[PDB]
Every structure is written in C-alpha cells, then in structure tokens.
Amino acid sequence: PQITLWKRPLVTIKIGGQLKEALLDTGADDTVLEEMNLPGRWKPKMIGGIGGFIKVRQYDQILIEICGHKAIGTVLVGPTPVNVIGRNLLTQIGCTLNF
Amino acid sequence: PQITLWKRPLVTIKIGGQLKEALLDTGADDTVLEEMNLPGRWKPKMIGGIGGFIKVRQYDQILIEICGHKAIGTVLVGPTPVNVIGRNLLTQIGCTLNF
Ligand SMILES: CC[C@H](C)CN(C[C@@H](O)[C@H](Cc1ccccc1)NC(=O)O[C@H]1CO[C@H]2OCC[C@H]21)S(=O)(=O)c1ccc2c(c1)OCO2
C-alpha cells in the first residue's frame, strides 16, 4: 500500500502468534518491541535512542508479519515507548520512501 | 524521488540559512534538529523516545527546504544525537511509505 503521514503509520503485526500494533519507523535502524514473552533464545544488548540507552533482549531470526508481508530478522524487546518497526525489517517487506 | 532503506534516509535540508543533514523519519511526530542559534521567540518542550526525554526549544513557522521541496512549520531544537524530519514536514513535501 501507499501510506500518507498525516497520522502515525501504525500497522498490525503478527509475532510469536500474537497480533500487535507497531509503528513503521524509518528513523530506527532496528526493530524494538515493548516487553513481551517470545519463544526462542535471546542475548542481552544495549540500544540508544533520542533520550539515552536502554537494555533489551535480542531475538534473532524471528518470524514477523507486517501488514500482511512476511519478514524474518532481529527483534529487540525492552522498555521502548512504543513498538517500532525499523529498517532491518522495512527493507524485507520492500518498503521505500517516496516524494 | 524514491529512497530505499538499506541505509539511513539522510538528506540535505536548508534551515536558518544553513545546510544540514537530517533523517526522513516516519516515526517522528515532530521535527527535531541539533542545537542551533535560531532567532526569534520559542517555547520549551520535552519529547520522549528510547532512553527517555530531552529538553528542546520549539520554534514555529520556520522555513525549511528538503531536497528542494519547501515547507514551513514547527521545528524543535535541542541536544538530539541526530537531525530528524518528522511527519509535520514530511506531509508537506508529499512523502509516503510504499510497499
Ligand atoms: C516513539 C517513537 C520513536 C522512538 C520516536 N523517535 C523517532 C525514531 O525514528 C528515532 C529517531 C532517532 C535515530 C538515531 C538516534 C536517536 C533518535 N529512532 C530510534 O530511536 O531508533 C532506535 C532504534 O533503532 C536504532 O536506530 C536508531 C536508534 C535506535 S525519537 O527520536 O525519539 C522522536 C522524534 C520526534 C518526536 C518525538 C520522538 O516526540 C514527538 O516528536
């Protein structure tokens, strides 16, 4: 689809068998989701945003469907203010910016 | 143009007679720029993201050019690690997400 930006580009995602709402965030390198239970091993990592750094759990090679488009990649879980879909997954679904 | 997301979507902007680099950021409600000494009045604001909040100065009706596309609107100035063009200006240049 073509998504205008008068509102937040929020979409439904499916991860670990659960539906969620997430923000398509071209300013995020990585995908960061709010605290949740996820199947798989993980590794503690640090990620930095506009306000500093937070501790997250890194899940690699996770299946995640974004607005009907399938992706498989890294998902960071931790105290992010909102679920964000970053460029690591936006590229997988073929997302570009256009003006 | 069309911008792929393999790398950060950095573009040149012109603001306050200065050229800078900034991210086209669909996850940013507002536009937040590195510290710069803009003239005129301003109002304090706090904006939150990963890591917490930062204090910024809100300037209204600022003229910005983004890839030769002119816009005018609110710009927040503060100690942000990166310049981000938010949806308040992205809508003005006709920017969409497409997949
Ligand atoms: C609440 C939704 C987002 C987290 C909001 N952020 C825009 C993001 O695009 C941000 C923009 C950004 C980009 C680089 C450094 C700091 C902030 N990217 C980000 O935090 O990404 C992190 C996750 O991937 C990693 O790659 C980049 C940092 C990591 S933000 O910078 O904090 C932000 C921008 C304008 C705003 C605002 C918050 O409140 C209202 O106006």
Kindly report the three-state secondary structure assignment for every residue of A54-75: EEEEEEEEEEEEECCEEEEEEE
CB atoms within 10 A of CB A83: 20
- CA A92 – CA B76 distance, rounded (Å): 32
Contact residues, chain B, for A65 at CB < 8 Å: none
Alpha helices per DSSP H over chain B = 87-90
Method used to determine the 3D structure: X-ray
Residue A47 beta carbon below 6 angstroms from any ligand 1 atom: yes
- CA B94 – CA A4 distance, rounded (Å): 8
Structure tokens given for A68: 């009907």
**Residue B92 near residue B67, CB atoms below 8 Å:** no
A71 burial via Cβ count (<10 Å: 0-12, 13-18, 19+): buried
Task: For tokens 């798989």, name the residue.
Answer: A40
Query: Cβ contact (<8 Å) for B5 and A93?
Result: no
| Phi, psi angle pair for B93, to nearest 5° | -100, 5
Which residues in chain B precede a discontinuity of more than 2.5 Å between C and N?
Answer: none
Task: For tokens 């990620």, name the residue.
Answer: A47
Separation of A37 CA from ligand 1 center, angstroms?
24
Q: Name the DSSP class of B92.
A: G
Domain boundaries, chain B: 1-99
Query: Cβ contact (<8 Å) for A48 and B81?
Result: yes
Residue A78 beta carbon below 6 angstroms from any ligand 1 atom: no
Kindly provide the resolution of this structure in angstroms, with one decimal. 2.0
